[PDB]
Amino acid sequence: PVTNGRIIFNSIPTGFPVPGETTIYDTTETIDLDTAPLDGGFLLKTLELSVDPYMRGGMRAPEKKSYSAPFTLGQPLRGYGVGVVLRSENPQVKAGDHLYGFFEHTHYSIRKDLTGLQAIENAYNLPWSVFIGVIGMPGKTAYMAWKEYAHPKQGETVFVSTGAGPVGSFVIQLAKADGLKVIASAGSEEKVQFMKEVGADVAFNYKTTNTAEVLEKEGPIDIYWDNVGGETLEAALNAANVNARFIECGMISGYNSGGAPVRNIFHVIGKSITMTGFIVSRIEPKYSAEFYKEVPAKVASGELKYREHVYNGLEKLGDVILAVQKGENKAKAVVHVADDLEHHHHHH
Amino acid sequence: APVTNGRIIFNSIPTGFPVPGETTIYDTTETIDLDTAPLDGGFLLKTLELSVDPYMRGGMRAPEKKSYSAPFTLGQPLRGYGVGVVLRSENPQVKAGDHLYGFFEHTHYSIRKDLTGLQAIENAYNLPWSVFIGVIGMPGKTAYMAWKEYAHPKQGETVFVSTGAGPVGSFVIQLAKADGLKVIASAGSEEKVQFMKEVGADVAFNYKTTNTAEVLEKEGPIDIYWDNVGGETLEAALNAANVNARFIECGMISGYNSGGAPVRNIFHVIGKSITMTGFIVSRIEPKYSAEFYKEVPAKVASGELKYREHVYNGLEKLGDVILAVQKGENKAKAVVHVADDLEHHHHHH
Ligand SMILES: NC(=O)c1ccc[n+]([C@@H]2O[C@H](COP(=O)([O-])OP(=O)(O)OC[C@H]3O[C@@H](n4cnc5c(N)ncnc54)[C@H](OP(=O)(O)O)[C@@H]3O)[C@@H](O)[C@H]2O)c1
Ligand SMILES: NC(=O)c1ccc[n+]([C@@H]2O[C@H](COP(=O)([O-])OP(=O)(O)OC[C@H]3O[C@@H](n4cnc5c(N)ncnc54)[C@H](OP(=O)(O)O)[C@@H]3O)[C@@H](O)[C@H]2O)c1
Ligand code: NA
């Protein structure tokens, strides 16, 4: 029998998550990989777990019942991941199958069927982590909301906040393929270099650069991709062109402080702005087939560039959640939970 | 026999609300002889009705921060929408008695070289001339055109209309009911609540004596929000919004006299997948202008489209009417009656 560790949602944070208090790591549960009773289901080994900015918002008290369900106190966290089937008594599932979907933040789970899971099409033998990033929900977010809401015209100017993340860096590349001038900002020099590498025309570190002054010089802006909200949205509103489109994807500047105010929303009227918020899952059905047919080949060839920040060990996941909220992840945050016994064979 | 050609002059930039007598002054030093004034191929135009609109506060600022539109010039007459009648014309296309709609300086008389900025009024139903600066004027166009452009209504949805008793909001209420929507609407007085009910609001309340969030909780969620107010009312609508709501951003009067009104819960735009569209009526008007003038007059004449107005008599009051509109003290669409029209006048005892 081996350890089946779990990352537990333990207490509601007031500001930023507190690793070891907000989330705890539990190693008291075990599983026998050969003996675990499957009951016609299958044994699924967690390989890669995504850590995403939205996880902070699920750390709240239980309130009525809405579409947005908070994490349950005392239960494992959960989110997108990749796993492999070790042992199956279910005819739809074969040992060695790699599956994508929501995973509890544990080493192993026993699933009765494929509800919530999809077989992964990996024709290019890409690292499994790409299916929770550029070929996962963050890539879908950029791909689908851009096509749905940007209405880009060649020669217009777009401002992308958090341009070095998995969403923003995808958006930059879609915007350049449409012939737009791209302004993008991130929180470190290494992220600025990546933004230039994926083709940002103006790439800057918002911690060492006056954002409003850059937008004044390089704008006005026809499209704002909002990942930050707050003062950065205010800056975009001040620099907006008439008939600008504001794609409201995230507002991370308020995730750990109860939201961030906007004081100049009147520009939406004065400048005839269309500001559209979206949740990627709501618009994905229209685009999922096209996304999975188009994106893997471009990741394999380098047409679509990506970066990731891999953290090794389920026990780090709580710290990784804080790292993302604090902007300390260098790129898309991946918790590598376990290896797959193929490609990475352990030997001395 | 020269008569006073009075003028409302923009005199100083206000800090909060306009101050009649300081922000605006009434100047009676100019005279005009209606019979002898040189027209020089132009025509003499007599001001009949002037609109006072909420946006006028926004033009009362320094000329440097010139933003979307043009600010009023210090020392010059104010201006805005109005109706006037031609008294005397040396212009072959313009005839005495012609009634014209467009931008008017806030004066009793003007000499125009041509019809620039003006359009003949089609008044087949002999409606009061003031309807062409309200329900059949820019405020009615605002409701008519933005609703058709942005509401994408579906039968049985719920709309919340702020400032529901004004010329914009009460027009919106009627469009929404015609589309089969449930309508919630709020205004600032009991008399305005009665009017909102008269034009068919299903839920009509006075937001000053009734908590908006409580009404929206009981009567929502809301699929469409028509924003005339911004600020805490926009915040309340965001919290009560349905998934895929449409927020039509028309005005935000709660911040016109206080440097804007903040919004603290704009994150609801993401969580509830809201489409929030701001607009300026003059930008979308060309697309709808012909259909508007073809459809609306007959409905005003028949009572199908209902309207109210609050008439103030006398050009010298206009600055006070501007403050009144900002303070919510106008009972309905604010109209300054400048002069009567002599179309059917015959002097006799
Ligand atoms: N369906 C949706 O609407 C949807 C879907 C996916 C993602 N999102 C949102 O997209 C945004 C980015 O997602 P992602 O997967 O690409 O995450 P990410 O870029 O890998 O991580 C979040 C990044 O946000 C930056 N950040 C943290 N605090 C900040 C602050 N106060 N001010 C400015 N930047 C801050 C940090 O990068 P810097 O170096 O730039 O500071 C951090 O690395 C998030 O806001 C997410 O909530 C929305
Ligand atoms: N192109 C455009 O975007 C466009 C065009 C025309 C008009 N508008 C806007 O539409 C709105 C209504 O225009 P209207 O012609 O129909 O004017 P209106 O209703 O005749 O007059 C303004 C009204 O706003 C209400 N009000 C004033 N201060 C308020 C405050 N702090 N909080 C809440 N309500 C307040 C008042 O009525 P109650 O408080 O009693 O309800 C006041 O009567 C304005 O915001 C205007 O700027 C926009
Ligand atoms: Na950072």
PDB file of N, CA, C and O in Angstrom, chain A residues 18-48:
ATOM      1  N   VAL A  18      -3.179  31.201   2.792  1.00  0.00           N
ATOM      2  CA  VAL A  18      -2.079  30.901   3.709  1.00  0.00           C
ATOM      3  C   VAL A  18      -1.754  29.417   3.590  1.00  0.00           C
ATOM      4  O   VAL A  18      -2.466  28.577   4.162  1.00  0.00           O
ATOM      5  N   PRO A  19      -0.721  29.042   2.838  1.00  0.00           N
ATOM      6  CA  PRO A  19      -0.398  27.620   2.710  1.00  0.00           C
ATOM      7  C   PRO A  19      -0.127  27.022   4.081  1.00  0.00           C
ATOM      8  O   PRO A  19       0.551  27.625   4.916  1.00  0.00           O
ATOM      9  N   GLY A  20      -0.700  25.845   4.328  1.00  0.00           N
ATOM     10  CA  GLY A  20      -0.638  25.232   5.639  1.00  0.00           C
ATOM     11  C   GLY A  20      -1.766  25.618   6.575  1.00  0.00           C
ATOM     12  O   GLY A  20      -1.984  24.928   7.576  1.00  0.00           O
ATOM     13  N   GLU A  21      -2.480  26.712   6.289  1.00  0.00           N
ATOM     14  CA  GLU A  21      -3.708  27.054   7.003  1.00  0.00           C
ATOM     15  C   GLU A  21      -4.920  27.013   6.080  1.00  0.00           C
ATOM     16  O   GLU A  21      -5.882  26.284   6.353  1.00  0.00           O
ATOM     17  N   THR A  22      -4.905  27.789   4.996  1.00  0.00           N
ATOM     18  CA  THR A  22      -5.996  27.749   4.023  1.00  0.00           C
ATOM     19  C   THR A  22      -6.140  26.363   3.416  1.00  0.00           C
ATOM     20  O   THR A  22      -7.250  25.827   3.305  1.00  0.00           O
ATOM     21  N   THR A  23      -5.017  25.765   3.028  1.00  0.00           N
ATOM     22  CA  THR A  23      -4.943  24.405   2.515  1.00  0.00           C
ATOM     23  C   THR A  23      -3.975  23.608   3.385  1.00  0.00           C
ATOM     24  O   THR A  23      -2.965  24.146   3.849  1.00  0.00           O
ATOM     25  N   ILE A  24      -4.289  22.337   3.621  1.00  0.00           N
ATOM     26  CA  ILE A  24      -3.370  21.449   4.328  1.00  0.00           C
ATOM     27  C   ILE A  24      -3.109  20.213   3.477  1.00  0.00           C
ATOM     28  O   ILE A  24      -3.917  19.831   2.620  1.00  0.00           O
ATOM     29  N   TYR A  25      -1.950  19.609   3.701  1.00  0.00           N
ATOM     30  CA  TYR A  25      -1.534  18.388   3.026  1.00  0.00           C
ATOM     31  C   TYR A  25      -1.659  17.212   3.986  1.00  0.00           C
ATOM     32  O   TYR A  25      -1.092  17.237   5.088  1.00  0.00           O
ATOM     33  N   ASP A  26      -2.408  16.192   3.567  1.00  0.00           N
ATOM     34  CA  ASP A  26      -2.779  15.052   4.400  1.00  0.00           C
ATOM     35  C   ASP A  26      -2.202  13.779   3.793  1.00  0.00           C
ATOM     36  O   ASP A  26      -2.486  13.468   2.634  1.00  0.00           O
ATOM     37  N   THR A  27      -1.392  13.038   4.559  1.00  0.00           N
ATOM     38  CA  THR A  27      -0.849  11.777   4.057  1.00  0.00           C
ATOM     39  C   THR A  27      -1.371  10.564   4.823  1.00  0.00           C
ATOM     40  O   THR A  27      -0.769   9.484   4.751  1.00  0.00           O
ATOM     41  N   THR A  28      -2.478  10.706   5.551  1.00  0.00           N
ATOM     42  CA  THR A  28      -2.929   9.608   6.404  1.00  0.00           C
ATOM     43  C   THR A  28      -3.681   8.521   5.641  1.00  0.00           C
ATOM     44  O   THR A  28      -3.864   7.425   6.180  1.00  0.00           O
ATOM     45  N   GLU A  29      -4.131   8.792   4.419  1.00  0.00           N
ATOM     46  CA  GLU A  29      -4.867   7.802   3.647  1.00  0.00           C
ATOM     47  C   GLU A  29      -3.924   6.999   2.754  1.00  0.00           C
ATOM     48  O   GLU A  29      -2.959   7.534   2.200  1.00  0.00           O
ATOM     49  N   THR A  30      -4.212   5.706   2.631  1.00  0.00           N
ATOM     50  CA  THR A  30      -3.435   4.767   1.837  1.00  0.00           C
ATOM     51  C   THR A  30      -4.317   4.098   0.789  1.00  0.00           C
ATOM     52  O   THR A  30      -5.548   4.152   0.854  1.00  0.00           O
ATOM     53  N   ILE A  31      -3.664   3.471  -0.187  1.00  0.00           N
ATOM     54  CA  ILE A  31      -4.336   2.682  -1.214  1.00  0.00           C
ATOM     55  C   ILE A  31      -3.397   1.565  -1.654  1.00  0.00           C
ATOM     56  O   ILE A  31      -2.185   1.765  -1.777  1.00  0.00           O
ATOM     57  N   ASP A  32      -3.954   0.378  -1.875  1.00  0.00           N
ATOM     58  CA  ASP A  32      -3.198  -0.739  -2.432  1.00  0.00           C
ATOM     59  C   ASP A  32      -3.527  -0.803  -3.916  1.00  0.00           C
ATOM     60  O   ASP A  32      -4.661  -1.121  -4.292  1.00  0.00           O
ATOM     61  N   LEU A  33      -2.547  -0.470  -4.758  1.00  0.00           N
ATOM     62  CA  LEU A  33      -2.826  -0.337  -6.185  1.00  0.00           C
ATOM     63  C   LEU A  33      -3.330  -1.643  -6.790  1.00  0.00           C
ATOM     64  O   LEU A  33      -4.138  -1.619  -7.729  1.00  0.00           O
ATOM     65  N   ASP A  34      -2.870  -2.787  -6.266  1.00  0.00           N
ATOM     66  CA  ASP A  34      -3.282  -4.080  -6.802  1.00  0.00           C
ATOM     67  C   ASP A  34      -4.597  -4.556  -6.201  1.00  0.00           C
ATOM     68  O   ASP A  34      -5.357  -5.264  -6.871  1.00  0.00           O
ATOM     69  N   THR A  35      -4.876  -4.186  -4.949  1.00  0.00           N
ATOM     70  CA  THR A  35      -5.987  -4.756  -4.198  1.00  0.00           C
ATOM     71  C   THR A  35      -7.186  -3.831  -4.065  1.00  0.00           C
ATOM     72  O   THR A  35      -8.296  -4.320  -3.827  1.00  0.00           O
ATOM     73  N   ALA A  36      -7.005  -2.530  -4.232  1.00  0.00           N
ATOM     74  CA  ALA A  36      -8.119  -1.610  -4.100  1.00  0.00           C
ATOM     75  C   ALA A  36      -9.335  -2.175  -4.837  1.00  0.00           C
ATOM     76  O   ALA A  36      -9.234  -2.478  -6.038  1.00  0.00           O
ATOM     77  N   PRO A  37     -10.469  -2.356  -4.166  1.00  0.00           N
ATOM     78  CA  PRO A  37     -11.659  -2.852  -4.871  1.00  0.00           C
ATOM     79  C   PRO A  37     -12.158  -1.792  -5.842  1.00  0.00           C
ATOM     80  O   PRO A  37     -12.417  -0.648  -5.456  1.00  0.00           O
ATOM     81  N   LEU A  38     -12.282  -2.177  -7.112  1.00  0.00           N
ATOM     82  CA  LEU A  38     -12.665  -1.234  -8.151  1.00  0.00           C
ATOM     83  C   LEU A  38     -14.166  -1.202  -8.416  1.00  0.00           C
ATOM     84  O   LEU A  38     -14.696  -0.137  -8.742  1.00  0.00           O
ATOM     85  N   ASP A  39     -14.876  -2.321  -8.257  1.00  0.00           N
ATOM     86  CA  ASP A  39     -16.319  -2.354  -8.483  1.00  0.00           C
ATOM     87  C   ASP A  39     -16.610  -1.861  -9.904  1.00  0.00           C
ATOM     88  O   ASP A  39     -17.174  -0.785 -10.112  1.00  0.00           O
ATOM     89  N   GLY A  40     -16.077  -2.593 -10.889  1.00  0.00           N
ATOM     90  CA  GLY A  40     -16.325  -2.259 -12.280  1.00  0.00           C
ATOM     91  C   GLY A  40     -15.779  -0.926 -12.744  1.00  0.00           C
ATOM     92  O   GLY A  40     -15.858  -0.628 -13.942  1.00  0.00           O
ATOM     93  N   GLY A  41     -15.282  -0.090 -11.838  1.00  0.00           N
ATOM     94  CA  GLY A  41     -14.653   1.163 -12.205  1.00  0.00           C
ATOM     95  C   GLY A  41     -13.200   0.949 -12.566  1.00  0.00           C
ATOM     96  O   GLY A  41     -12.797  -0.137 -13.007  1.00  0.00           O
ATOM     97  N   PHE A  42     -12.395   1.996 -12.383  1.00  0.00           N
ATOM     98  CA  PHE A  42     -10.974   1.913 -12.698  1.00  0.00           C
ATOM     99  C   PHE A  42     -10.161   2.734 -11.705  1.00  0.00           C
ATOM    100  O   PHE A  42     -10.681   3.608 -11.013  1.00  0.00           O
ATOM    101  N   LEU A  43      -8.876   2.402 -11.621  1.00  0.00           N
ATOM    102  CA  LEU A  43      -7.921   3.098 -10.771  1.00  0.00           C
ATOM    103  C   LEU A  43      -7.205   4.136 -11.619  1.00  0.00           C
ATOM    104  O   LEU A  43      -6.589   3.790 -12.631  1.00  0.00           O
ATOM    105  N   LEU A  44      -7.290   5.399 -11.207  1.00  0.00           N
ATOM    106  CA  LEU A  44      -6.775   6.526 -11.975  1.00  0.00           C
ATOM    107  C   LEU A  44      -5.684   7.214 -11.169  1.00  0.00           C
ATOM    108  O   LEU A  44      -5.938   7.685 -10.055  1.00  0.00           O
ATOM    109  N   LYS A  45      -4.486   7.299 -11.745  1.00  0.00           N
ATOM    110  CA  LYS A  45      -3.335   7.906 -11.087  1.00  0.00           C
ATOM    111  C   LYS A  45      -3.162   9.342 -11.578  1.00  0.00           C
ATOM    112  O   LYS A  45      -3.029   9.583 -12.786  1.00  0.00           O
ATOM    113  N   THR A  46      -3.167  10.287 -10.638  1.00  0.00           N
ATOM    114  CA  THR A  46      -3.020  11.697 -10.976  1.00  0.00           C
ATOM    115  C   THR A  46      -1.591  11.982 -11.416  1.00  0.00           C
ATOM    116  O   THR A  46      -0.636  11.653 -10.708  1.00  0.00           O
ATOM    117  N   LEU A  47      -1.437  12.616 -12.576  1.00  0.00           N
ATOM    118  CA  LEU A  47      -0.116  12.942 -13.098  1.00  0.00           C
ATOM    119  C   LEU A  47       0.213  14.422 -13.002  1.00  0.00           C
ATOM    120  O   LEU A  47       1.272  14.781 -12.474  1.00  0.00           O
ATOM    121  N   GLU A  48      -0.666  15.288 -13.520  1.00  0.00           N
ATOM    122  CA  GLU A  48      -0.458  16.727 -13.566  1.00  0.00           C
ATOM    123  C   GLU A  48      -1.722  17.425 -13.088  1.00  0.00           C
ATOM    124  O   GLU A  48      -2.827  17.062 -13.500  1.00  0.00           O
TER     125      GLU A  48
END
